[PDB]
Design a protein around this ligand. Structure first.
Ligand code: NAD
Ligand code: WWE
Ligand code: ZN
Lengths: 285, 6
């Protein structure tokens, strides 16, 4: 087995060994809650009067009534977009040549703001960064400043070329994921040395299946408020069985987990300096 | 392509 012990300290020693060259991050809503974007699991959607609560993120319903979704986006639109310590931890992985890919479930663009490039990212459920007119014969593209303005004005966004609906480039429940997700997944996991899984409950599919694509020897560290990804005793990650050999669960806040790992790697000062400098720049802008 | 579910 590659880890000398099933602890964060074991993971950190492995990351600074010659074997650990290619890291894939798998991240979800938990990495952005400290930036002010709420997840869905942690313990506000009644004003919308939907047939069933989860219809607001389903494509069948959005197509029939896009108003509730845009009204929700307005309510959730953050005053500033400040990536978290966890985001900047992944920026450090990129800076140090360790990041093969960040697969993200999030649509909030904070990975881009933190300095991950398009090539580093698989935005598996799309993004608010770009939007497109929904008419197949048009597909005119619009930037966030255009979309934010229509969300705030409480005016459903319409294409200026054809007056069809303009939809953020996000993947609703019931929509196909982007081709890039499947293409990257079929190559990235051939030689990955570490999976870093953060801020996800591993319940949305097919994203959740990504953890099963690494080689059987690849260590997998989960940094998450709750243990996730274990097989269901009714219906994976093996942290606690007598057969456990490569999966480690660090239970707590993503920011605190990344800080603790950074400190073991000797990156604590680098990470603090980076976050403070980036946040100060965003404040100045 | 496979659809988002769950
Ligand atoms: N910021 C965003 O773009 C955003 C926000 C909400 C939901 N979504 C997406 O919607 C879908 C459903 O969302 P969901 O929230 O039910 O699923 P999810 O898989 O994203 O679940 C979030 C997970 O993070 C954990 N968590 C929350 N805050 C944490 C923190 N500070 N530190 C550590 N762990 C923390 C939760 O316990 C849960 O296990 C997912 O694809 C999700 O990524 C995106
Ligand atoms: C699948 O998991 C993706 C969803 C369909 C669930 S999107 C979930 C969040 C939608 C509300 C976002 C609130 C506004 C965010 C603005 C970001 C601008 C960059
Ligand atoms: Zn159009």
């Amino acid at each position: 087995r590659l880890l000398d012990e099933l602890t964060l300290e074991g993971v950190a020693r492995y990351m600074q060994s010659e074997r650990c060259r290619r890291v894939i991050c798998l991240v979800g809503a938990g990495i952005s809650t400290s930036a002010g974007i709420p997840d869905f699991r942690s313990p506000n959607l009644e004003k919308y009067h939907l047939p069933y609560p989860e219809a607001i993120f389903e494509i069948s319903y959005f197509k029939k009534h896009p108003e509730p979704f845009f009204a929700l986006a307005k309510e959730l639109y953050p005053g500033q977009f400040k990536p978290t310590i966890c985001h900047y931890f992944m920026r450090l992985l990129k800076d140090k040549g360790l990041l093969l890919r960040c697969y993200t479930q999030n649509i909030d663009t904070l990975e881009r703001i933190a300095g991950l490039e398009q090539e580093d990212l698989v935005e598996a459920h799309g993004t608010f960064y770009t939007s497109h007119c929904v008419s197949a014969s048009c597909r005119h593209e619009y930037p966030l400043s255009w979309m934010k303005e229509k969300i705030f004005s409480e005016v459903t966004p319409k294409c200026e070329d054809c007056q069809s609906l303009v939809k953020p480039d996000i993947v609703f429940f019931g929509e196909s994921l982007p081709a890039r997700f499947f293409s990257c997944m079929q190559s990235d996991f051939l030689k990955v040395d570490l999976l870093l899984v953060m801020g996800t409950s591993l319940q949305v599919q097919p994203f959740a299946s990504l953890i099963s694509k690494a080689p059987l020897s690849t260590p997998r560290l989960l940094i998450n408020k709750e243990k996730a990804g274990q097989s269901d005793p009714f219906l994976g990650m093996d942290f606690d069985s007598k057969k456990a050999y490569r999966d480690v669960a660090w239970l707590g806040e993503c920011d605190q987990g990344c800080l603790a790992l950074a400190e073991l790697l000797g990156w604590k000062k680098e990470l603090e300096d980076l976050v403070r400098r980036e946040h100060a720049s965003i404040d100045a802008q | 392509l496979p659809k988002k579910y769950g």
